[PDB]
Design an enzyme around this catalytic site. Structure first.
Site, mmCIF file in Angstrom:
data_model
loop_
_atom_site.group_PDB
_atom_site.id
_atom_site.type_symbol
_atom_site.label_atom_id
_atom_site.label_comp_id
_atom_site.label_asym_id
_atom_site.label_seq_id
_atom_site.Cartn_x
_atom_site.Cartn_y
_atom_site.Cartn_z
ATOM 1 N N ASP A 141 4.777 23.914 39.155
ATOM 2 C CA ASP A 141 6.089 24.482 39.453
ATOM 3 C C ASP A 141 6.729 23.688 40.584
ATOM 4 O O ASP A 141 6.423 23.924 41.757
ATOM 5 C CB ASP A 141 5.930 25.957 39.820
ATOM 6 C CG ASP A 141 7.235 26.622 40.171
ATOM 7 O OD1 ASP A 141 8.286 26.028 39.886
ATOM 8 O OD2 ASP A 141 7.203 27.729 40.751
ATOM 9 N N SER A 154 23.763 15.699 40.091
ATOM 10 C CA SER A 154 24.138 15.048 38.849
ATOM 11 C C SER A 154 25.595 14.603 38.901
ATOM 12 O O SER A 154 26.445 15.245 39.518
ATOM 13 C CB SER A 154 23.915 16.006 37.681
ATOM 14 O OG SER A 154 24.419 15.475 36.478
#
Ligand SMILES: NN[C@@H](c1nnnn1CCc1ccccc1)C1CCCCC1
Length: 330
Positions: free
Chosen positions: A35, A199
């Site tokens: 994780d 992004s």
């Protein structure tokens, strides 16, 4: 040193991935959920409330000759999905795919919430976010990656998640045969303890690329791709019959639809998520309404590049003094 371990989807939908981890002496092998959005290594154990164990493999520290109770240490975590777990702490030897850390904090669960009990395939979590998020009290503990870092050939790990198929977590090296083209690296902020990056934009199917900054985290422990409501609306508007359902809890679409791809930007590079990766199947057994793999992050507080996005790429988690993230097509 290096390590290399295969990671396997827990079900036919890729809801999560499990990776075998050796704990203790002699080894006790548990299948853990790696994780990159949390920083605790915790396991079902011989100390877990018996009624909260339902098929998981447990760590028994009393059977490990290298286990040592970490005096006075406790842990408690409340995850973003409402799940939780808590317990005490041992140090023990932990190996992942041939890479061994001695003295790793192994957080032994005394209590787990229902969602963990109900998933018999996940024996615990292995956190790979930054150690600043580790919940052990009163002495915070380091992640497996942080402990291994100095020994690794290169201070990196890579995530190569498969679509409906196994993949690989590597530690300490970049497998240049595992991706196509080049790896594009992008800046990371550790200010929230996550692998947080920005992004450069997105495209829906064959549509034009929209240049726009999307701050989010690379999170192997999240199944889906959570993005701003504007972006998600633009995606599902291209799917006839798709709608946001308050009763189901997100966007659903007719199971008969062919989904368009979704492209996200990494600097000047582009990662293409094929449409099939966005199909998470019937909302309930036998339904013709299917659950979408791209959902709104509104009310989460952060965008999440979860498995839906990460499995379309070869992803480098670069733990150099200034961390960065790398993405390649594959
Ligand atoms: N793997 N760490 C995530 C998580 N913690 N608990 N669940 N997730 C899965 C992600 C998620 C998001 C929204 C709804 C459901 C699931 C954290 C979520 C909150 C932000 C930091 C990472």
């Amino acid at each position: 040193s290096t390590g290399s371990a295969t990671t396997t989807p827990i079900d036919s939908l890729d809801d999560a991935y499990i990776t075998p981890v050796q704990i203790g002496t002699p080894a006790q092998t548990l299948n853990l959920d790696f994780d990159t959005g949390s920083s605790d290594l915790w396991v079902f154990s011989s100390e877990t409330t018996a009624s909260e164990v339902d098929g998981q493999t447990i760590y028994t520290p009393s059977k490990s000759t290298t286990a040592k109770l970490l005096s006075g240490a406790t842990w408690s975590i409340s995850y973003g999905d409402g799940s939780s777990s808590s317990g005490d702490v041992y140090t023990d030897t932990v190996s992942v795919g041939g890479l061994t850390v001695t003295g790793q904090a192994v957080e032994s669960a005394k209590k787990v919430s229902s969602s963990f009990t109900e998933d018999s395939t996940i024996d615990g979590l292995l956190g790979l976010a930054f150690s600043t998020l580790n919940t052990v009290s009163p002495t915070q503990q380091k992640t497996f990656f942080d402990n291994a870092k100095a020994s690794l050939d290169s201070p990196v790990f890579t995530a190569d998640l498969g679509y409906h198929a196994p993949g690989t977590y590597n530690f300490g090296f970049i497998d240049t045969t595992a991706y196509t083209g080049s790896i594009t690296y992008t800046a990371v902020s550790t200010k929230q303890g996550f692998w947080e990056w920005t992004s450069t934009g997105y495209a829906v199917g064959s549509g034009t690329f929209k240049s726009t900054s999307i701050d989010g985290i690379a999170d192997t422990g999240t199944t889906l791709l959570y993005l701003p409501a504007t972006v998600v609306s633009a995606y599902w508007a291209q799917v006839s019959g798709a709608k946001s359902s308050s009763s189901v809890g997100g966007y659903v679409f007719p199971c008969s639809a062919t989904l368009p791809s979704f492209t996200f930007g990494v600097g000047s590079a582009r990662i293409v998520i094929p449409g099939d990766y966005i199909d998470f199947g019937p909302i309930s057994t036998g339904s013709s309404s299917c659950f979408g793999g791209i959902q709104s992050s509104a009310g989460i507080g952060i965008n999440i590049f979860g498995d839906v996005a990460l499995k379309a790429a070869f992803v480098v988690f670069n733990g150099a003094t200034t961390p960065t993230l790398g993405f390649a097509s594959k």
